[PDB]
C-alpha cells in the first residue's frame, strides 16, 4: 500500500511540475505564429487556436537598466549561498547513498561468504534455465547415465537451492516436481526390502 | 524589510469607481492616487499648473479621437522627463497606458524629434492594475526541477538491487 | 540532383499499390537507420514468436549506452536476422551508425519538424538532415536547390538550432 | 525574434519529452530500470540545454515588451490572460528557501576569500594527486 501511495505521490508531483512548464510553451509559441502563420499554427493547442487568431507576440525594444554595485554583488553572494546549500545537500545525499550501499553491499558479502564456505567440490556442475522461473541456477548431474545405465526415465539431475531460512544448501531433483514442501526427504525416501 | 515586487502589485479602489466610475476620461485620474504614479513626474507639475491657472496602429486613432489627449501633448512637449501617456483603450473594461520617458535633444546635428524611451508596462484590467517573462520561465523551470528531484529521489528510494538479478522494485 | 532532376523513377508524386498519389518520401541517415533497426527487431520478434508457436531481452537492443555497444547489438541483430550473406547491408548500417547525427527518436522528430515546418522540398529537407552546415551560405552553395528559395536568416537560424540539437556523445 | 524562436522550439521539444516520460510512467506496470534511466538522462540533459540556451539569450528576452493584441478580446478571455500573467512562485519552494536561508544563517568578504583559497588549494591538490599515479 505504501508503494501505491508513493507512486500516486510521484505521479501527482510530476503532473504539478509539468502543468507550470506547459504555460511557458503556450506563451513562447506566439512569436513565430505572428511572424509566420503556417509554421505557428501547429505549435499552439487547439483550444488556444479557438481562443484567438494568433499574432500575439511582436518584437519590441526596452533599454537595459543602468548597473551599479547594488544588485550584482548581492546576486552573486546569494548565488554563492544557494550553491553552498546545494553542496550541503550534495554531501548529505551522497552520505545517505553510501550508507545504504555499504549496508546492502556488506549484506551480500555475508551471503557471498556463506555460499563460498558452504560449497564443497569432479562433480558435473553447470548452469540451467528453470522451466518455471527461467533464470540460471546451478545443477549437478548425479545419475548413472554416463556410467553405463540404460535407464532412460530419469536423467539424475539435481538443482542446487540455497535455503533462505536455514542458510543451507538443498538438492531438488528434476522428476519429483510435484512435492513442494519440507517433507520431501521422508516422502521420497524409498527402499528395497527382501522377506523370506 | 520584505517588499512585494511592484510588477505583481495590484491596487483596487472601490470608492473611486463607485463615485466616478471607469472611463477613459478619468483613467489618469484613477491612476493618480496609485503608488505607481511618481510624484516627480511632469504630469503632476502640469496638474498643479492647471490648478493654479484655474484658481488665478491604434496610436494615431487614439491621437485623433480625443481633444484632452491633444492638450496632453501641448502641455507635455514643453516639459521633458518622465511622463505618463495612454497606450490603447478598448471599452468598456480595458485600458493600458504607455510608460515612456522623453529627452528633447534639441542639439545641433539631430534632425529627429524628442527621444521617447520605454520604462515600464502597466495594464488596467477592470478596476485592477498589473505591472519579466524571463523570471516567469525560470521560476516555472526551477519549480519543475524541484518536483522532478523529489520524484527521482523517491523512485531511487523505491529501487532495490541484488547482484544475481540486477535492479528491481 | 542539383536542378532537382529526379526523373520518372523518383517523381515527387508516387503512385502506390492503392492507386492514390502520395508525396515522395526521403529519409536521412538517422531516419533510415531507425526505420531499418525497427524493421529488423520486429522481424526478430516475429521469428521468435513463430519458433515459440512451433515448439524482456529486446528492450536492451534499442536503448544503447554507447556507439560501440550499439555496433555490437547491430552485429548480433545481423547475425540473428540476416544470416551474414549480405555485406552491403552491413556496410550501409555501419556507415549509418558511425555518422548518425542524431541517436534519439525524439530529437530526430525535432529535426524533422524544424526542417519541414517551412515546407521545403523533401530532397532539401533530407539533405539538411544529413549535412551539418555552420553558415547559411555554406549550405546554399552545397545545396544549389536551397538557393533563391530560403532566406539567409531562416537558414542560419535552422542551422544553428540543428547544431544545438546535436546530442553530445 | 530568432532567439525567442529557438527558445520556443527547444522548450517545445522539452515539453514533448515530458509528455513522453509521463505517458510511459502512467502505465500500471513499470518498465525495465534501464529504459527509465535512459529517459531520465535524456530529458534531464535536455533541461540542461534549455537552461543554457535561456542563459545565452537573456538580452533578447529582456528587450521584448509584452502587449496584448488589439484583436484579442480581454472581456471574454480575462481569465486566460490572468492565467499567463501571474508569475509568483509556488509557496512550498518559497518557504523551502526560507528555511534554507534560516539554517544557513568585511567578515563575510574575508570568509569569501578564504573559500577562494580553499577551492584553489583543493583543485591544485587533486591535480597533484592525479599526476602522482600514472592512469594511462
Amino acid at each position: 500500500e505504501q508503494f501505491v501511495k508513493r507512486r500516486r505521490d510521484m505521479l501527482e508531483h510530476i503532473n504539478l511540475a509539468m502543468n507550470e512548464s506547459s504555460l511557458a510553451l503556450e506563451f513562447v509559441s506566439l512569436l513565430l505564429s505572428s511572424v509566420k502563420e503556417s509554421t505557428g499554427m501547429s505549435s499552439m493547442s487547439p483550444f488556444l487556436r479557438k481562443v484567438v487568431k494568433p499574432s500575439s507576440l511582436n518584437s519590441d525594444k526596452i533599454p537595459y537598466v543602468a548597473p551599479t554595485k547594488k544588485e550584482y554583488i548581492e546576486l552573486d553572494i546569494l548565488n554563492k549561498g544557494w550553491k553552498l546549500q546545494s553542496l550541503n545537500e550534495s554531501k548529505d545525499l551522497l552520505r545517505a547513498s553510501f550508507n545504504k550501499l555499504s549496508s546492502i553491499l556488506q549484506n551480500e558479502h555475508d551471503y557471498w561468504n556463506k555460499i563460498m564456505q558452504s560449497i564443497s567440490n569432479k562433480d558435473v556442475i553447470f548452469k540451467i534455465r528453470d522451466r518455471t522461473s527461467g533464470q540460471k541456477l546451478l545443477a549437478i548431474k548425479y545419475g548413472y547415465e554416463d556410467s553405463g545405465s540404460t535407464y532412460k526415465h530419469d536423467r539424475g539431475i539435481a538443482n542446487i537451492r540455497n535455503n533462505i531460512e536455514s542458510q543451507n544448501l538443498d538438492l531438488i531433483p528434476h522428476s519429483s516436481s510435484v512435492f513442494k514442501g519440507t517433507d520431501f526427504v521422508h516422502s521420497v525416501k524409498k527402499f528395497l526390502r527382501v522377506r523370506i | 524589510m520584505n517588499v512585494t515586487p511592484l510588477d505583481e502589485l495590484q491596487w483596487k479602489s472601490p470608492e473611486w469607481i463607485q463615485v466616478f466610475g471607469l472611463r477613459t476620461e478619468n483613467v489618469l485620474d484613477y491612476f493618480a492616487e496609485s503608488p505607481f504614479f511618481d510624484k516627480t513626474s511632469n504630469n503632476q507639475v502640469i496638474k498643479m499648473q492647471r490648478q493654479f491657472s484655474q484658481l488665478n496602429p491604434a496610436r494615431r486613432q487614439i491621437l485623433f479621437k480625443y481633444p484632452m489627449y491633444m492638450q496632453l501633448e501641448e502641455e507635455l512637449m514643453k516639459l521633458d522627463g518622465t511622463e505618463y501617456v495612454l497606450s490603447s483603450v478598448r471599452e468598456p473594461d480595458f485600458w493600458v497606458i504607455r510608460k515612456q520617458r522623453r529627452t528633447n535633444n534639441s542639439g545641433v546635428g539631430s534632425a529627429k524629434g524628442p527621444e521617447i524611451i520605454p520604462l515600464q508596462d502597466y495594464y488596467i484590467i477592470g478596476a485592477n492594475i498589473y505591472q519579466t517573462i524571463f523570471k516567469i520561465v525560470q521560476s516555472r523551470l526551477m519549480s519543475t526541477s524541484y518536483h522532478l528531484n523529489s520524484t527521482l529521489e523517491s523512485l531511487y528510494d523505491l529501487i532495490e538491487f541484488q547482484p544475481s538479478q540486477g535492479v528491481h522494485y | 540532383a542539383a536542378t532537382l532532376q529526379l526523373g520518372q523513377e523518383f517523381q515527387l508524386k508516387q503512385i502506390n499499390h492503392q492507386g492514390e498519389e502520395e508525396e515522395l518520401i526521403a529519409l536521412n541517415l538517422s531516419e533510415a537507420r531507425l526505420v531499418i533497426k525497427e524493421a529488423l527487431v520486429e522481424r526478430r520478434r516475429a521469428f521468435k514468436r513463430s519458433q515459440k508457436k512451433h515448439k524482456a531481452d529486446d528492450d536492451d537492443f534499442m536503448h544503447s549506452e554507447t556507439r560501440e555497444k550499439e555496433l555490437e547489438s547491430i552485429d548480433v541483430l545481423l547475425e540473428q536476422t540476416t544470416g551474414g550473406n549480405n555485406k552491403d547491408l552491413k556496410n550501409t548500417m555501419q556507415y549509418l551508425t558511425n555518422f548518425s547525427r542524431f541517436r534519439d527518436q525524439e530529437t530526430v522528430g525535432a529535426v524533422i519538424q524544424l526542417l519541414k515546418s517551412t515546407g521545403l522540398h523533401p530532397f532539401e529537407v533530407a539533405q539538411l538532415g544529413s549535412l551539418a552546415c555552420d553558415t547559411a551560405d555554406e549550405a546554399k552553395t552545397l545545396i544549389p536547390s536551397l538557393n533563391n528559395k530560403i532566406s539567409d536568416d531562416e537558414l542560419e537560424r535552422i542551422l544553428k538550432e540543428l547544431s544545438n540539437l546535436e546530442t553530445l556523445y | 525574434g530568432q532567439a525567442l524562436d529557438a527558445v520556443r522550439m527547444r522548450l517545445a521539444q522539452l515539453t514533448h519529452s515530458l509528455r513522453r516520460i509521463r505517458d510511459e510512467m502512467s502505465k500500471a506496470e513499470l518498465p525495465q530500470w534501464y529504459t527509465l534511466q535512459s529517459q531520465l538522462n535524456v530529458t534531464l540533459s535536455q533541461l540542461v540545454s534549455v537552461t543554457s540556451t535561456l542563459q545565452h539569450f537573456q538580452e533578447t528576452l529582456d528587450s521584448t515588451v509584452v502587449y496584448p493584441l488589439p484583436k484579442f478580446p480581454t472581456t471574454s478571455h480575462e481569465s486566460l490572460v490572468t492565467t499567463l500573467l501571474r508569475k509568483k512562485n509556488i509557496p512550498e519552494v518559497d518557504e523551502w528557501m526560507k528555511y534554507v536561508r534560516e539554517t544557513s544563517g568585511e567578515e563575510i568578504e574575508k570568509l569569501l576569500q578564504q573559500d577562494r583559497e580553499i577551492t584553489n588549494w583543493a583543485r591544485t591538490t587533486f591535480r597533484n594527486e592525479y599526476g602522482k599515479h600514472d592512469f594511462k
Binding site: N19 | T4 | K116, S117 | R19
Partner: peptide
C-alpha cells in the same frame, strides 16, 4: 513534417499565488 503536436496541458484549476495587499485607501 510534424511527427505529433503537443497535447493541451492547460491547468485552469491552478489557484495562482497573486499577492493582494494595496486595497485600503
Amino acid at each position: 513534417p510534424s511527427y505529433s503536436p503537443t497535447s493541451p496541458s492547460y491547468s485552469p484549476t491552478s489557484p495562482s499565488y497573486s499577492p493582494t495587499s494595496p486595497s485600503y485607501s
